[PDB]
UniProtKB/Swiss-Prot annotation:
Parent sequence residues shown: 90 to 419 of 419
GO terms under biological process: proteolysis
Gene this chain is encoded by: EAPA
Protein's name in the database: Endothiapepsin
UniProt keyword annotation of ATP-binding present: no
Naturally occurring in which organism (per UniProt): Cryphonectria parasitica (Chestnut blight fungus)
The UniProt record lists the keyword Protease: yes
Active site: D35, S199
Family from the record: Belongs to the peptidase A1 family.
Catalytic reaction equation(s): Hydrolysis of proteins with specificity similar to that of pepsin A, prefers hydrophobic residues at P1 and P1', but does not cleave 14-Ala-|-Leu-15 in the B chain of insulin or Z-Glu-Tyr. Clots milk
The enzyme's E.C. designation: 3.4.23.22
Amino acid sequence: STGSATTTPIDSLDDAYITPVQIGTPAQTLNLDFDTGSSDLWVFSSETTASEVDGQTIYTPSKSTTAKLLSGATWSISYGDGSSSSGDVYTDTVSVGGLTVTGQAVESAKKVSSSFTEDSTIDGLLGLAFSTLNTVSPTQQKTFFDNAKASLDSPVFTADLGYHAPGTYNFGFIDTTAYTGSITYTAVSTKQGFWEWTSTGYAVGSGTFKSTSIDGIADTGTTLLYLPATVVSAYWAQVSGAKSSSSVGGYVFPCSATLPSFTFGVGSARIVIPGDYIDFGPISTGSSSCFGGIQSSAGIGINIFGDVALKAAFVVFNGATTPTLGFASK
């Protein structure tokens, strides 16, 4: 089997991407944030504290003839940005882009933090990291991909995120029309539960490539590119007037600037992030200070190849017995 679904930016800045997902019988379609940096599929629901729902579409398990309470199971997750959610668990039929999994754990939120409430466009998350990170207790549950894997034509999924445009998540096949040149594959460590890999270096603009190992994660659920302070300083030093602002919470730059590109290495291959992908717009409405899309990972504890990086590439998440990651230009 295979699946193919379009993923759409939630706003004009590509702050996140939503993908429609069918849950239950008859189908209830929710728009979920596919997140290769976590491993829980959770949704706003009829169980979510009413004051914490503001415009989201909810899953109502009582209206699904295939929903079953997973008795005694609870979940609770906290993300790197300080957001969180928790609740109980149903199993139900879940379909993405024509690919159907029966008996998928659907984690129903009883509580969500303010950042989730305030984002009316995101109805929940669909985790695509390794199932070892799944938070369901006392019986850990598998991700949608893990459940689908054996049925897929090939044990892979791909992320093809757009810049200010829709893109695609495919399951079970590689669309050879979706990228240019060849796909370069690179080793993955699953030791921390992530799609963790080592970039071979970087360049800023038309500058020379610096060969240096940068361990980090391919994380579709993180907006920005978070890299070591040395790398990030080298980038922003090429933008007149750019500075790190503790009050704003990162590097800002004059909105009048033209940003240089940023290149990262994948083995001997190179992925170029155009400068415009690094512009996250005014820090507040009407401001002439703009927020940067490359930020320091110092104090996160991990480097994160988020959407800023991934949307410059066609990315293969190869879930074979020994997982790997592939990157192609597009």
